[PDB]
Symmetry: D2
């Protein structure tokens, strides 16, 4: 089995272990964070939005035993000092949020791993993959890659269909996004100087910037420079949606758009016709779930403006995309 280490046992890291535990041929040999093993085990077993872990998890000296198999636990904030070489670690899932570019992420390779997947945008100099859209750009010679953002994994399959079947002149994106741990619990100073993320997460609609639309060219080259957008964090603990308002190169109807999305559906890109809300998306394994009920095509004097909306669980949808990308990568 390919051996994986998870650096950062947070929301994405812990769910990544859940998904990898359900996979065969790949196993997690070690996890690293800033806390003792008892804290990590408790958070792995009990989850406020994703439910209890469906499996066995017990504590040992400096390890957790998951489904009968031992996983080493480390608490070292500097990746260069981790024993990845000693443990034969092939791929590191970098999920701390503090090593989100190539030079920082390479500390893992100096620690003895062969490859690193960043669970976030990683810059314009590393390949960036949304599984189901462009995973084929990988050939295994890359040392550091990126699985993009949760929002990019939601937007990209929707935008890819619009570009291929109708063509895109331009588009503005709005993601209505669950609050995350980078927002404060209550009004307090923020480490990055962000005056809006400084505010109480569960009390506010919080405008915030996102690069998912601007950087879309890394996933869909033909859309480079055609999209921008922003985000609104709102008080749901997980579950999000992405709206895209676009000008297309050809006329379209709501029925034509919806039919194209369904034709492109896959394990990564679901198609929905029910009148769902965000909680219905919690825990889904699609990276993106197009919502045909929200498609709108407005025609005013022959000029068309199109709205398309797709849901995503920013935690579990992205985690499943990250693990799919990891598995595809690990075979090269």
């Amino acid at each position: 089995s390919i051996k994986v280490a998870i650096n950062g046992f947070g929301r994405i890291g812990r769910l990544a272990l859940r998904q990898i535990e359900k996979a065969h041929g790949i196993e997690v040999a070690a996890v690293n964070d800033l806390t003792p093993a008892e804290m990590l085990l408790h958070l792995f077993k009990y989850d406020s939005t994703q439910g209890r872990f469906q499996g066995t998890a017990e504590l040992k000296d400096d390890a957790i035993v998951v489904n009968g198999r031992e996983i080493k636990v480390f608490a070292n904030p500097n990746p260069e000092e981790l024993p990845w070489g000693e443990l034969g670690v092939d791929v590191v899932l970098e999920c701390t949020g503090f090593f989100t570019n190539k030079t920082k992420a390479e500390a893992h390779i100096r620690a003895g791993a062969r490859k690193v997947v960043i669970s976030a945008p990683g810059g314009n100099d590393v390949k960036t993959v949304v599984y189901g859209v462009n995973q084929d750009i990988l050939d295994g010679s890359e040392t550091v890659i990126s699985a993009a953002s949760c929002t990019t994994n939601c937007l990209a399959p929707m935008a890819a269909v619009l570009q291929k079947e109708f063509g895109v002149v331009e588009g503005l994106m709005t993601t209505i996004h669950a609050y995350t741990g980078d927002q404060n619990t209550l009004d307090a100073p923020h480490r990055k100087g962000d005056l809006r993320r400084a505010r109480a997460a569960a009390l506010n609609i919080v405008p915030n910037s996102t690069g998912a639309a601007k950087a879309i060219g890394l996933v869909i080259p033909e859309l480079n420079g055609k999209l921008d957008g922003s985000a609104q964090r709102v008080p749901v603990a997980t579950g999000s949606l992405t709206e895209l308002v676009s000008v297309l190169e050809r006329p379209a109807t709501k029925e034509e758009i919806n039919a194209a999305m369904k034709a492109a559906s896959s394990e990564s890109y679901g198609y929905n016709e029910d009148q769902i809300v965000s909680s219905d998306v919690v825990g889904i394994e699609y990276g993106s779930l197009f919502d045909a009920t929200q498609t709108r095509v407005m025609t005013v004097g022959g000029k068309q403006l199109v709205k398309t909306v797709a849901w995503y669980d920013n935690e579990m949808s992205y985690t499943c995309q990250l693990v799919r990308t990891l598995e595809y990568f690990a075979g090269k």
Copy 2:
């Protein structure tokens, strides 16, 4: 001394009484609801989002005493039976949500009131007023008028400035809206058959339809048929924003758009440049609060798509617009 009756002592009705108490030339002679006076007084004094009433409020038999002055209390679900003639009520604020067209609202005229203002869209059979945009369409001979919806009062001043300064080809609106009482507390059947308002209000992003953009022609005739949009209810108990993505007739910059909004700012239309969030808008008295920090102009190959955003407290912003429209109307 124009005498007012409030039919429906809910969120809008109770806040309207707060505002009318601070107003000159208008006084509330009576309120009506489905509940005893003790319940109405308690809800007037204590408010979970708008704070405690800053004034005196005591109970008398079949009456409440507000700031030393008597207001009669009735509990009659049949408006046709209310004693508006014997009390001499000049204007009724119809705020129950159950009498939102001319034929139903005229029950107050048969009951002896002289005028009715509906605190919601009232159908195309009724003049619809956003104060600060089109109040001049009132000549005073109208019997029943409408103050539009909260979203309309937010959108109209923003769209009016864009139309005046640049011209609008078309636009799609997305309002990220506080949950309201027409949503269920927990998943349960919904009276109107709405599968999304059936869901727990405080747990979900809930897509829902709205006519604010569709009906904008009633307030700004030159924009008739050029705007559409929809809503997303999110878990804040009050406070909302409206995004408009539009194609304009002339080139624009972020600085030009913001300067025009600031020049037009007023008591009905505020202008903001701080990094605010939704809780900062709770209790504001603007009908709409333009947010210059969210203005975006995207240009791709000479083609432009424009994003503008305005905040509004769907409760208090609309209530102040309703009272402004009431005062203007009563002067004719």
Copy 3:
């Protein structure tokens, strides 16, 4: 199979259908509510706190198809007129909240059903059962019984162990309880005149009365008149805990109380030693989950005051208790 009808396809009614679907020998033949079948199907499939239904659910004409089996759907607010006799309904789960005494619940018997279980306190004149505590009082000749409240199913197994092993002089209960559908979404008039349930559910700590402790005598007769208590509704959509502060008849230690609770553990009464919070209880199938980490026995000059705490998902814990009582009841007749 025993054929069951659910009157009131609400939180308890819909989750009861999920649990009965997993049970053998008992089947839900019909559900009734105030709404069209498409609305009921959608709410059965999608649930904001309990997750998507793990099964198949499709629509037919005045029926829903669940796991390949048809369930007729009705929309009649008056239970007298439901076709329970025509459908051979043995037991009706009365979950509307509007027929919570014996004479009202008997509308289902006049409609052709043989038996009724009320999913709430049903008054002092009907047998009231917490499964795992007093289900043995059912001999099958009863027509209308009650499965008590969610809080009673949480309190009763905990209080029973205290009574048997230490004896209870008196106790005051405080249940910290998730908000429910009887609270308004925002500040608004309340149908029952309750000034505190009138307030926005997800914004407030809301004091409210509860009869679970006062009525405990119906489940544990030896505790009749020895308990009272109250509730605090808080902004979690489901998941609750019950604290009991009691004076015992004999000295106790934290370890002795915890050992007694674990010894009494079962499928209805779980035992927990982890540092859990309310979200960890969402969806559990225990009727009550004792939390050994919160036990406190205080001694001041030989005088002892004891705190014991149990968790419960007021929706799913109670629903499973309701179905367990339904299954035991249907076995007797």
Copy 4:
């Protein structure tokens, strides 16, 4: 002209400045935190639970101007490098949460400040004052004192009335408490190793320990060893209540208790008879607000168990008590 410096411009620090701006004879000369002045001004002006600041607030060169008066701003995480001596700081309000004992708080003294008031429990070797209960223990010669915790300021006036009017044998406290910043936004590792504060603050009922009842002896010596309790954090951003279940030394009625609380009510200890909920308490200036509607006296064979409940805005109630203690203390230095 008492000059105050606020170390830690958090929830308590920012509200403390709001209240001191309304106080005569005392003024804030400087504030210190870990962040640039622009962030601090923004958080002072805009507040998600306490509303916008009712006053003027603008930015200047490494300072904020509040109501026309400039307040220097510092960003030094080491307290004993601060220029308190150069600025003439008389009293430092220590509100960081990182210097909550005499040894750490004395960094402000070595930095040239005369006095320090810790906005939290400060250890058994620092005088602890709940204003309105025991401020008379201060004689002005102390260098480091404590204003206790928010829960202590809520419990103490209530327990003092019960002790004076009836006498207390023992009592167990349960505080239903707003979530605070020491809880994580979402499930994540927690710096102090607390498995329950590690969990999502706004999604959970979270059991947690508190020392308010055990340490009550520092404020009311006659109750030393007589009280204990714990806390339950719930998803309200501010606003809390404290329940006390106590055994009293003489018989009592709810009417007697409520009358005694009402007679003792003051600016520090309010009395309420309306059916309020937690949002009604946000921003109040009482340190504790007794709720007579929740008083319960249970009698079982002559044995009595008493429940009394008091509200408090854990932020603003405590801040007002802190400023009251500061004014009394400063009048003696």
